[PDB]
Ligand binder design. Structure first.
Ligand code: MG
Length: 80
């Protein structure tokens, strides 16, 4: 367990704004990274969510792994 989550399988509509409003439910977010495709201006299918608190990351990972966002099932892993 770490305070940084690798999030995969995100729908093309998800950006930093929408992922913050989803993942901020679990606790204080230090940083969110959703790289954009410089051609489509859409995400590349993954993000990093960093919590202040490892306990918040653990709660987020339990609750969001295999959860469905906009009709797509997401993958949540500890990063590092
Ligand atoms: Mg930290």
């Amino acid at each position: 367990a770490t305070d940084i989550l690798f999030v995969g399988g995100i729908d093309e509509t998800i950006d930093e704004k929408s992922l913050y409003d989803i993942f901020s439910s679990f606790g204080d977010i230090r940083n969110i990274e959703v790289p954009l495709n410089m051609t489509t201006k859409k995400n590349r299918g993954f993000a990093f969510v960093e919590y202040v608190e490892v306990d918040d990351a653990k709660h987020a990972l339990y609750n969001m792994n295999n959860f469905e966002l906009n009709g797509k099932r997401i993958h949540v892993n500890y990063s590092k």
